[PDB]
Amino acid sequence: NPTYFFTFGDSYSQTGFSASGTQPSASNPMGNPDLGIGTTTNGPNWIGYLTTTENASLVLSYNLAAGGATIDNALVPAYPGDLASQFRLFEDVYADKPASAPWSAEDAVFGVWIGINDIGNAYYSTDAETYTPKLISRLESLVEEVYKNGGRKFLFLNVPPTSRSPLFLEQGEEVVKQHAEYLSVYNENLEGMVDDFTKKKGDVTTVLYDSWSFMTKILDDPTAYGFPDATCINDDGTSCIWWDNYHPGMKYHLLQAEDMKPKLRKLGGW
C-alpha cells in the first residue's frame, strides 16, 4: 500500500529522475537514479530522506524537480524546466494513473518546493507586494491541475533563507536585506494561498512546512547542530551547512527531513 510522492521544485529538490528511467517500486523507491545521486547535497536530499529514511510505510518517489526552476517562464523566466513544465510532464505521464503509478486521492502526495529562484532572480526588479501575488496565483493554478486529476494531499515548503547563503552574503548586507524582505512577502502570500486553497476545497489535506524558520534556527546557532559556523562551504555535504555557495548539504537536508517527519504524518507516508 504505497504512497505515491510526486515532487516539483528546483535544485534544492532535483535528483535527476527521468520519466523514461527505471520507475519506482518497493525494491527501488526512488526509481532512478540511485538514492544519493543527482542532488546538490553530496548525497541524498530531503526527498530521498523522506522517501527512504523517514518513511513510516512504503513511499514511491516521482521527483520532477529541475535545477534552476522558476514557477513559470512567463513570469520570472530562467530555465526551460520551470514548475509549469514539471506539471506538464506530470500531466503527460502520471496524471491519468497508469499501471506504473496507479495512484488515488487517498495515497498520492504532491510536494512542491518552489520560489527560491523566482525571488533570487526578481527580488530587486519587482515590487514584492504586487508581484508575488502573481507568482503565487500561478502556483495555485498549477496546483488546481493536479486537483482536477484527483489529487487531494499536498505538501508545500516555503522558501528558506537563501538570503544568507554565501552567494548572497558576499553581495553585501543591504542586498541580503533586500532579498530577505522580498522573500518574507512571498512566504506570507504562499501561506495565505495554501490556507485559502485548503478552506475553499474542503476535501484536501495540506501541510505548509516552514523551512524558513528551521533553516534560520540552524543558521542562528550552527554549533547546536554540529556545524562549526553558518557560512563555511564543504562539498562533502556534512562538514558545513553549505555544499556550495548556494545549496545546503546532505546533513542539512537530513536534519530538515527529520524535522518534517512529524509534520507529514497526516499525509500518510510518515
PDB file of C-alpha atoms in Angstrom:
ATOM      1  CA  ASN A   1       0.000   0.000   0.000  1.00  0.00           C
ATOM      2  CA  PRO A   2       2.387   2.674  -1.211  1.00  0.00           C
ATOM      3  CA  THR A   3       2.272   6.426  -1.003  1.00  0.00           C
ATOM      4  CA  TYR A   4       2.908   7.970  -4.420  1.00  0.00           C
ATOM      5  CA  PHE A   5       5.050  11.038  -3.686  1.00  0.00           C
ATOM      6  CA  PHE A   6       5.119  13.365  -6.705  1.00  0.00           C
ATOM      7  CA  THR A   7       7.502  16.273  -6.131  1.00  0.00           C
ATOM      8  CA  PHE A   8       8.035  19.515  -8.016  1.00  0.00           C
ATOM      9  CA  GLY A   9      10.719  22.095  -7.435  1.00  0.00           C
ATOM     10  CA  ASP A  10      14.198  23.362  -8.190  1.00  0.00           C
ATOM     11  CA  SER A  11      17.791  22.351  -7.476  1.00  0.00           C
ATOM     12  CA  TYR A  12      17.113  22.051  -3.714  1.00  0.00           C
ATOM     13  CA  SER A  13      14.928  19.110  -4.755  1.00  0.00           C
ATOM     14  CA  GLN A  14      16.341  17.740  -8.009  1.00  0.00           C
ATOM     15  CA  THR A  15      17.613  14.187  -8.175  1.00  0.00           C
ATOM     16  CA  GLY A  16      17.877  13.655 -11.945  1.00  0.00           C
ATOM     17  CA  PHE A  17      14.841  11.350 -12.082  1.00  0.00           C
ATOM     18  CA  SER A  18      13.818  10.596 -15.665  1.00  0.00           C
ATOM     19  CA  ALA A  19      10.288   9.662 -16.591  1.00  0.00           C
ATOM     20  CA  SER A  20      11.821   7.154 -19.030  1.00  0.00           C
ATOM     21  CA  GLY A  21      14.306   5.776 -16.454  1.00  0.00           C
ATOM     22  CA  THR A  22      13.682   2.934 -14.022  1.00  0.00           C
ATOM     23  CA  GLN A  23      10.347   3.613 -12.351  1.00  0.00           C
ATOM     24  CA  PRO A  24       9.728   3.492  -8.595  1.00  0.00           C
ATOM     25  CA  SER A  25       8.931   0.167  -6.945  1.00  0.00           C
ATOM     26  CA  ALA A  26       9.054  -1.342  -3.495  1.00  0.00           C
ATOM     27  CA  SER A  27      12.588  -2.619  -4.131  1.00  0.00           C
ATOM     28  CA  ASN A  28      13.611   0.700  -5.663  1.00  0.00           C
ATOM     29  CA  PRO A  29      11.521   3.538  -4.220  1.00  0.00           C
ATOM     30  CA  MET A  30      13.410   6.380  -5.963  1.00  0.00           C
ATOM     31  CA  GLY A  31      13.103   4.702  -9.417  1.00  0.00           C
ATOM     32  CA  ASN A  32      16.194   6.465 -10.768  1.00  0.00           C
ATOM     33  CA  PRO A  33      18.945   7.416 -10.317  1.00  0.00           C
ATOM     34  CA  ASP A  34      20.275   5.581  -7.256  1.00  0.00           C
ATOM     35  CA  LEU A  35      19.460   7.156  -3.895  1.00  0.00           C
ATOM     36  CA  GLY A  36      22.061   9.823  -3.224  1.00  0.00           C
ATOM     37  CA  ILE A  37      22.902  10.574  -6.857  1.00  0.00           C
ATOM     38  CA  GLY A  38      21.812  13.623  -8.848  1.00  0.00           C
ATOM     39  CA  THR A  39      21.444  16.096  -5.994  1.00  0.00           C
ATOM     40  CA  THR A  40      23.034  19.353  -4.828  1.00  0.00           C
ATOM     41  CA  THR A  41      23.984  17.868  -1.431  1.00  0.00           C
ATOM     42  CA  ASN A  42      26.734  15.233  -1.998  1.00  0.00           C
ATOM     43  CA  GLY A  43      24.229  12.530  -1.004  1.00  0.00           C
ATOM     44  CA  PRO A  44      20.504  12.092  -0.525  1.00  0.00           C
ATOM     45  CA  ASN A  45      18.402  15.236  -0.389  1.00  0.00           C
ATOM     46  CA  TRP A  46      15.249  15.919   1.638  1.00  0.00           C
ATOM     47  CA  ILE A  47      13.126  13.869  -0.786  1.00  0.00           C
ATOM     48  CA  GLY A  48      15.478  10.915  -0.683  1.00  0.00           C
ATOM     49  CA  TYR A  49      15.495  11.051   3.109  1.00  0.00           C
ATOM     50  CA  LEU A  50      11.688  11.434   3.316  1.00  0.00           C
ATOM     51  CA  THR A  51      11.268   8.504   0.934  1.00  0.00           C
ATOM     52  CA  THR A  52      13.764   6.025   2.311  1.00  0.00           C
ATOM     53  CA  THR A  53      14.810   7.092   5.833  1.00  0.00           C
ATOM     54  CA  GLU A  54      11.905   8.923   7.452  1.00  0.00           C
ATOM     55  CA  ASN A  55       9.165   6.903   5.829  1.00  0.00           C
ATOM     56  CA  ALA A  56       6.724   5.048   8.055  1.00  0.00           C
ATOM     57  CA  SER A  57       5.467   2.878   5.174  1.00  0.00           C
ATOM     58  CA  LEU A  58       6.327   2.398   1.519  1.00  0.00           C
ATOM     59  CA  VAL A  59       6.822   5.696  -0.289  1.00  0.00           C
ATOM     60  CA  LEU A  60       7.462   5.803  -4.058  1.00  0.00           C
ATOM     61  CA  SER A  61       9.229   8.975  -5.257  1.00  0.00           C
ATOM     62  CA  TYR A  62       8.482  10.510  -8.686  1.00  0.00           C
ATOM     63  CA  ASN A  63      10.702  13.553  -8.479  1.00  0.00           C
ATOM     64  CA  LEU A  64      10.060  16.054 -11.262  1.00  0.00           C
ATOM     65  CA  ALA A  65      12.115  18.911  -9.723  1.00  0.00           C
ATOM     66  CA  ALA A  66      14.567  20.547 -12.132  1.00  0.00           C
ATOM     67  CA  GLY A  67      17.626  22.702 -11.488  1.00  0.00           C
ATOM     68  CA  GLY A  68      17.141  26.468 -11.751  1.00  0.00           C
ATOM     69  CA  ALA A  69      13.359  26.192 -11.969  1.00  0.00           C
ATOM     70  CA  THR A  70      11.130  29.199 -11.525  1.00  0.00           C
ATOM     71  CA  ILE A  71       7.327  28.933 -11.325  1.00  0.00           C
ATOM     72  CA  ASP A  72       6.540  29.945 -14.899  1.00  0.00           C
ATOM     73  CA  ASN A  73       8.817  31.418 -17.537  1.00  0.00           C
ATOM     74  CA  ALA A  74       6.012  33.798 -18.495  1.00  0.00           C
ATOM     75  CA  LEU A  75       6.526  35.449 -15.100  1.00  0.00           C
ATOM     76  CA  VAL A  76      10.139  35.176 -13.867  1.00  0.00           C
ATOM     77  CA  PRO A  77      11.998  33.142 -16.516  1.00  0.00           C
ATOM     78  CA  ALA A  78      15.146  31.100 -16.129  1.00  0.00           C
ATOM     79  CA  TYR A  79      15.360  27.553 -17.462  1.00  0.00           C
ATOM     80  CA  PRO A  80      13.064  25.505 -19.718  1.00  0.00           C
ATOM     81  CA  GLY A  81      12.131  23.127 -16.906  1.00  0.00           C
ATOM     82  CA  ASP A  82      10.064  25.620 -14.935  1.00  0.00           C
ATOM     83  CA  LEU A  83       7.384  24.468 -12.492  1.00  0.00           C
ATOM     84  CA  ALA A  84       4.776  24.781 -15.251  1.00  0.00           C
ATOM     85  CA  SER A  85       6.790  22.333 -17.382  1.00  0.00           C
ATOM     86  CA  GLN A  86       7.100  19.917 -14.467  1.00  0.00           C
ATOM     87  CA  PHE A  87       3.330  19.914 -14.080  1.00  0.00           C
ATOM     88  CA  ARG A  88       3.045  19.280 -17.818  1.00  0.00           C
ATOM     89  CA  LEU A  89       5.393  16.312 -17.515  1.00  0.00           C
ATOM     90  CA  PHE A  90       3.152  15.055 -14.695  1.00  0.00           C
ATOM     91  CA  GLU A  91       0.040  15.600 -16.843  1.00  0.00           C
ATOM     92  CA  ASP A  92       1.677  13.773 -19.762  1.00  0.00           C
ATOM     93  CA  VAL A  93       2.949  10.721 -17.872  1.00  0.00           C
ATOM     94  CA  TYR A  94       1.324  10.178 -14.476  1.00  0.00           C
ATOM     95  CA  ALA A  95      -1.851  12.242 -14.144  1.00  0.00           C
ATOM     96  CA  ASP A  96      -4.018   9.516 -15.724  1.00  0.00           C
ATOM     97  CA  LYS A  97      -2.901   6.966 -13.109  1.00  0.00           C
ATOM     98  CA  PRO A  98      -1.035   4.495 -15.356  1.00  0.00           C
ATOM     99  CA  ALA A  99      -0.177   0.995 -14.268  1.00  0.00           C
ATOM    100  CA  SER A 100       3.296   2.212 -13.306  1.00  0.00           C
ATOM    101  CA  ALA A 101       1.820   4.727 -10.824  1.00  0.00           C
ATOM    102  CA  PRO A 102      -1.804   3.743 -10.146  1.00  0.00           C
ATOM    103  CA  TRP A 103      -2.391   6.476  -7.582  1.00  0.00           C
ATOM    104  CA  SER A 104      -5.606   7.662  -5.948  1.00  0.00           C
ATOM    105  CA  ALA A 105      -6.699  10.594  -3.816  1.00  0.00           C
ATOM    106  CA  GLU A 106      -6.085   8.535  -0.678  1.00  0.00           C
ATOM    107  CA  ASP A 107      -2.471   7.617  -1.416  1.00  0.00           C
ATOM    108  CA  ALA A 108      -0.895  10.363  -3.552  1.00  0.00           C
ATOM    109  CA  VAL A 109       1.042  13.230  -2.017  1.00  0.00           C
ATOM    110  CA  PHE A 110       2.054  16.214  -4.139  1.00  0.00           C
ATOM    111  CA  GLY A 111       5.058  18.094  -2.767  1.00  0.00           C
ATOM    112  CA  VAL A 112       6.107  21.487  -4.129  1.00  0.00           C
ATOM    113  CA  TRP A 113       9.225  23.452  -3.198  1.00  0.00           C
ATOM    114  CA  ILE A 114       9.459  26.483  -5.466  1.00  0.00           C
ATOM    115  CA  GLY A 115      10.199  30.202  -5.219  1.00  0.00           C
ATOM    116  CA  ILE A 116      13.898  30.249  -4.388  1.00  0.00           C
ATOM    117  CA  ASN A 117      14.832  31.162  -7.954  1.00  0.00           C
ATOM    118  CA  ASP A 118      11.799  33.391  -8.597  1.00  0.00           C
ATOM    119  CA  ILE A 119      12.916  35.518  -5.653  1.00  0.00           C
ATOM    120  CA  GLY A 120      16.618  35.127  -6.458  1.00  0.00           C
ATOM    121  CA  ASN A 121      16.060  36.444  -9.980  1.00  0.00           C
ATOM    122  CA  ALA A 122      13.467  39.139  -9.325  1.00  0.00           C
ATOM    123  CA  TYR A 123      13.851  40.497  -5.750  1.00  0.00           C
ATOM    124  CA  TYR A 124      15.494  43.741  -6.969  1.00  0.00           C
ATOM    125  CA  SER A 125      13.459  44.358 -10.126  1.00  0.00           C
ATOM    126  CA  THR A 126       9.882  43.785  -8.988  1.00  0.00           C
ATOM    127  CA  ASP A 127       7.640  45.035  -6.204  1.00  0.00           C
ATOM    128  CA  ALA A 128       7.083  42.139  -3.775  1.00  0.00           C
ATOM    129  CA  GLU A 129       3.655  43.339  -2.600  1.00  0.00           C
ATOM    130  CA  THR A 130       2.127  43.449  -6.101  1.00  0.00           C
ATOM    131  CA  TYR A 131       4.337  40.951  -7.951  1.00  0.00           C
ATOM    132  CA  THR A 132       4.473  37.968  -5.580  1.00  0.00           C
ATOM    133  CA  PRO A 133       0.654  37.501  -5.691  1.00  0.00           C
ATOM    134  CA  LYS A 134       1.102  36.861  -9.426  1.00  0.00           C
ATOM    135  CA  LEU A 135       3.692  34.123  -8.776  1.00  0.00           C
ATOM    136  CA  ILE A 136       1.533  32.615  -6.025  1.00  0.00           C
ATOM    137  CA  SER A 137      -1.599  32.739  -8.193  1.00  0.00           C
ATOM    138  CA  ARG A 138       0.237  30.887 -10.964  1.00  0.00           C
ATOM    139  CA  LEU A 139       1.417  28.282  -8.444  1.00  0.00           C
ATOM    140  CA  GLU A 140      -2.192  27.890  -7.336  1.00  0.00           C
ATOM    141  CA  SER A 141      -3.424  27.348 -10.888  1.00  0.00           C
ATOM    142  CA  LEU A 142      -0.808  24.637 -11.384  1.00  0.00           C
ATOM    143  CA  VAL A 143      -1.961  23.002  -8.134  1.00  0.00           C
ATOM    144  CA  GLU A 144      -5.501  23.141  -9.481  1.00  0.00           C
ATOM    145  CA  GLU A 145      -4.449  20.951 -12.444  1.00  0.00           C
ATOM    146  CA  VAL A 146      -3.448  18.159 -10.059  1.00  0.00           C
ATOM    147  CA  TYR A 147      -6.626  18.779  -8.062  1.00  0.00           C
ATOM    148  CA  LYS A 148      -8.631  18.254 -11.240  1.00  0.00           C
ATOM    149  CA  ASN A 149      -6.726  14.980 -11.785  1.00  0.00           C
ATOM    150  CA  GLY A 150      -7.965  13.796  -8.360  1.00  0.00           C
ATOM    151  CA  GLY A 151      -5.063  14.873  -6.144  1.00  0.00           C
ATOM    152  CA  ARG A 152      -6.048  15.749  -2.599  1.00  0.00           C
ATOM    153  CA  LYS A 153      -2.933  15.643  -0.366  1.00  0.00           C
ATOM    154  CA  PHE A 154      -0.424  18.472  -0.784  1.00  0.00           C
ATOM    155  CA  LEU A 155       2.858  19.475   0.831  1.00  0.00           C
ATOM    156  CA  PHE A 156       4.208  22.993   0.280  1.00  0.00           C
ATOM    157  CA  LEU A 157       7.616  24.092   1.557  1.00  0.00           C
ATOM    158  CA  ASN A 158       8.095  27.801   1.983  1.00  0.00           C
ATOM    159  CA  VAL A 159      11.263  29.454   0.769  1.00  0.00           C
ATOM    160  CA  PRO A 160      14.315  29.074   3.060  1.00  0.00           C
ATOM    161  CA  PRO A 161      16.701  31.950   3.907  1.00  0.00           C
ATOM    162  CA  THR A 162      18.849  31.765   0.785  1.00  0.00           C
ATOM    163  CA  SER A 163      19.449  35.450   1.587  1.00  0.00           C
ATOM    164  CA  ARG A 164      22.087  34.040   3.989  1.00  0.00           C
ATOM    165  CA  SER A 165      23.735  31.623   1.576  1.00  0.00           C
ATOM    166  CA  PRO A 166      27.353  32.617   0.915  1.00  0.00           C
ATOM    167  CA  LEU A 167      26.335  33.638  -2.619  1.00  0.00           C
ATOM    168  CA  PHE A 168      24.089  36.367  -1.252  1.00  0.00           C
ATOM    169  CA  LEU A 169      26.179  37.213   1.814  1.00  0.00           C
ATOM    170  CA  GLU A 170      29.019  38.236  -0.480  1.00  0.00           C
ATOM    171  CA  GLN A 171      26.767  40.753  -2.261  1.00  0.00           C
ATOM    172  CA  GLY A 172      26.561  42.848   0.898  1.00  0.00           C
ATOM    173  CA  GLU A 173      24.241  43.158   3.844  1.00  0.00           C
ATOM    174  CA  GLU A 174      21.838  45.544   2.129  1.00  0.00           C
ATOM    175  CA  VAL A 175      21.361  43.020  -0.689  1.00  0.00           C
ATOM    176  CA  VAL A 176      20.822  40.276   1.870  1.00  0.00           C
ATOM    177  CA  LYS A 177      18.197  42.533   3.437  1.00  0.00           C
ATOM    178  CA  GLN A 178      16.505  43.443   0.132  1.00  0.00           C
ATOM    179  CA  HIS A 179      16.323  39.776  -0.820  1.00  0.00           C
ATOM    180  CA  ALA A 180      15.156  38.707   2.656  1.00  0.00           C
ATOM    181  CA  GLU A 181      12.380  41.328   2.784  1.00  0.00           C
ATOM    182  CA  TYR A 182      11.090  40.288  -0.642  1.00  0.00           C
ATOM    183  CA  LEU A 183      11.221  36.641   0.369  1.00  0.00           C
ATOM    184  CA  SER A 184       9.230  37.284   3.526  1.00  0.00           C
ATOM    185  CA  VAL A 185       6.398  38.792   1.447  1.00  0.00           C
ATOM    186  CA  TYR A 186       6.465  35.797  -0.908  1.00  0.00           C
ATOM    187  CA  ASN A 187       6.252  33.361   2.010  1.00  0.00           C
ATOM    188  CA  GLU A 188       3.356  35.265   3.621  1.00  0.00           C
ATOM    189  CA  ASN A 189       1.447  35.116   0.355  1.00  0.00           C
ATOM    190  CA  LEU A 190       2.295  31.434  -0.064  1.00  0.00           C
ATOM    191  CA  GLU A 191       0.832  30.730   3.374  1.00  0.00           C
ATOM    192  CA  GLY A 192      -2.317  32.689   2.584  1.00  0.00           C
ATOM    193  CA  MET A 193      -2.763  30.774  -0.669  1.00  0.00           C
ATOM    194  CA  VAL A 194      -2.316  27.379   0.978  1.00  0.00           C
ATOM    195  CA  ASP A 195      -4.780  28.374   3.703  1.00  0.00           C
ATOM    196  CA  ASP A 196      -7.328  29.688   1.185  1.00  0.00           C
ATOM    197  CA  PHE A 197      -6.959  26.640  -1.054  1.00  0.00           C
ATOM    198  CA  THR A 198      -7.378  24.258   1.885  1.00  0.00           C
ATOM    199  CA  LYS A 199     -10.508  26.019   3.148  1.00  0.00           C
ATOM    200  CA  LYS A 200     -12.106  26.562  -0.277  1.00  0.00           C
ATOM    201  CA  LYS A 201     -11.710  22.926  -1.419  1.00  0.00           C
ATOM    202  CA  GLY A 202     -12.726  21.461   1.945  1.00  0.00           C
ATOM    203  CA  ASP A 203     -11.575  17.965   0.945  1.00  0.00           C
ATOM    204  CA  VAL A 204      -7.780  18.362   0.838  1.00  0.00           C
ATOM    205  CA  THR A 205      -5.104  17.521   3.388  1.00  0.00           C
ATOM    206  CA  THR A 206      -2.343  20.137   3.275  1.00  0.00           C
ATOM    207  CA  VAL A 207       0.939  20.825   5.027  1.00  0.00           C
ATOM    208  CA  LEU A 208       2.813  24.100   4.803  1.00  0.00           C
ATOM    209  CA  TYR A 209       6.331  23.266   6.001  1.00  0.00           C
ATOM    210  CA  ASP A 210       8.159  26.318   7.341  1.00  0.00           C
ATOM    211  CA  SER A 211      11.632  25.535   6.047  1.00  0.00           C
ATOM    212  CA  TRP A 212      12.434  29.204   6.549  1.00  0.00           C
ATOM    213  CA  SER A 213      12.213  29.056  10.331  1.00  0.00           C
ATOM    214  CA  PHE A 214      14.001  25.675  10.506  1.00  0.00           C
ATOM    215  CA  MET A 215      16.990  26.725   8.430  1.00  0.00           C
ATOM    216  CA  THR A 216      17.067  30.073  10.234  1.00  0.00           C
ATOM    217  CA  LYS A 217      17.350  28.258  13.594  1.00  0.00           C
ATOM    218  CA  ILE A 218      20.389  26.371  12.341  1.00  0.00           C
ATOM    219  CA  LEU A 219      21.979  29.456  10.759  1.00  0.00           C
ATOM    220  CA  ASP A 220      21.472  31.325  14.029  1.00  0.00           C
ATOM    221  CA  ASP A 221      23.067  28.595  16.197  1.00  0.00           C
ATOM    222  CA  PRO A 222      25.034  26.315  13.880  1.00  0.00           C
ATOM    223  CA  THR A 223      27.145  24.626  16.554  1.00  0.00           C
ATOM    224  CA  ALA A 224      23.997  23.308  18.237  1.00  0.00           C
ATOM    225  CA  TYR A 225      23.529  21.257  15.079  1.00  0.00           C
ATOM    226  CA  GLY A 226      27.169  20.181  14.768  1.00  0.00           C
ATOM    227  CA  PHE A 227      28.209  22.763  12.218  1.00  0.00           C
ATOM    228  CA  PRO A 228      31.221  24.969  13.002  1.00  0.00           C
ATOM    229  CA  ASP A 229      29.632  28.182  11.683  1.00  0.00           C
ATOM    230  CA  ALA A 230      26.836  29.316   9.412  1.00  0.00           C
ATOM    231  CA  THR A 231      28.977  30.335   6.429  1.00  0.00           C
ATOM    232  CA  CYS A 232      31.583  27.707   5.597  1.00  0.00           C
ATOM    233  CA  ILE A 233      31.264  25.631   2.421  1.00  0.00           C
ATOM    234  CA  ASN A 234      32.282  21.991   2.037  1.00  0.00           C
ATOM    235  CA  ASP A 235      31.209  19.773  -0.769  1.00  0.00           C
ATOM    236  CA  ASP A 236      31.358  16.702   1.458  1.00  0.00           C
ATOM    237  CA  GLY A 237      27.864  17.954   2.357  1.00  0.00           C
ATOM    238  CA  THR A 238      28.310  17.331   6.085  1.00  0.00           C
ATOM    239  CA  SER A 239      31.156  19.463   7.447  1.00  0.00           C
ATOM    240  CA  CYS A 240      29.338  22.749   6.719  1.00  0.00           C
ATOM    241  CA  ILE A 241      25.742  23.848   6.224  1.00  0.00           C
ATOM    242  CA  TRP A 242      26.619  24.722   2.609  1.00  0.00           C
ATOM    243  CA  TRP A 243      27.611  22.217  -0.065  1.00  0.00           C
ATOM    244  CA  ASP A 244      28.489  25.091  -2.398  1.00  0.00           C
ATOM    245  CA  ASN A 245      27.803  28.802  -2.100  1.00  0.00           C
ATOM    246  CA  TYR A 246      24.065  28.486  -2.803  1.00  0.00           C
ATOM    247  CA  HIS A 247      22.907  24.989  -1.733  1.00  0.00           C
ATOM    248  CA  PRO A 248      22.934  23.189   1.632  1.00  0.00           C
ATOM    249  CA  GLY A 249      24.495  19.774   2.040  1.00  0.00           C
ATOM    250  CA  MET A 250      23.099  16.352   2.836  1.00  0.00           C
ATOM    251  CA  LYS A 251      23.475  16.844   6.591  1.00  0.00           C
ATOM    252  CA  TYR A 252      21.218  19.906   6.447  1.00  0.00           C
ATOM    253  CA  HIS A 253      18.739  18.018   4.220  1.00  0.00           C
ATOM    254  CA  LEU A 254      18.652  15.116   6.682  1.00  0.00           C
ATOM    255  CA  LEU A 255      18.018  17.476   9.598  1.00  0.00           C
ATOM    256  CA  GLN A 256      15.213  19.083   7.611  1.00  0.00           C
ATOM    257  CA  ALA A 257      13.690  15.732   6.690  1.00  0.00           C
ATOM    258  CA  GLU A 258      13.802  14.726  10.362  1.00  0.00           C
ATOM    259  CA  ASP A 259      12.141  17.992  11.305  1.00  0.00           C
ATOM    260  CA  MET A 260       9.486  17.417   8.631  1.00  0.00           C
ATOM    261  CA  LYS A 261       8.572  13.829   9.517  1.00  0.00           C
ATOM    262  CA  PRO A 262       6.123  14.510  12.405  1.00  0.00           C
ATOM    263  CA  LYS A 263       4.539  17.331  10.402  1.00  0.00           C
ATOM    264  CA  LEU A 264       3.925  14.916   7.486  1.00  0.00           C
ATOM    265  CA  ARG A 265       2.164  12.189   9.489  1.00  0.00           C
ATOM    266  CA  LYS A 266      -1.213  13.464   8.267  1.00  0.00           C
ATOM    267  CA  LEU A 267      -0.109  12.939   4.632  1.00  0.00           C
ATOM    268  CA  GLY A 268       0.125   9.162   5.071  1.00  0.00           C
ATOM    269  CA  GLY A 269       3.740   8.126   4.434  1.00  0.00           C
ATOM    270  CA  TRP A 270       5.408   9.311   7.623  1.00  0.00           C
TER     271      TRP A 270
END
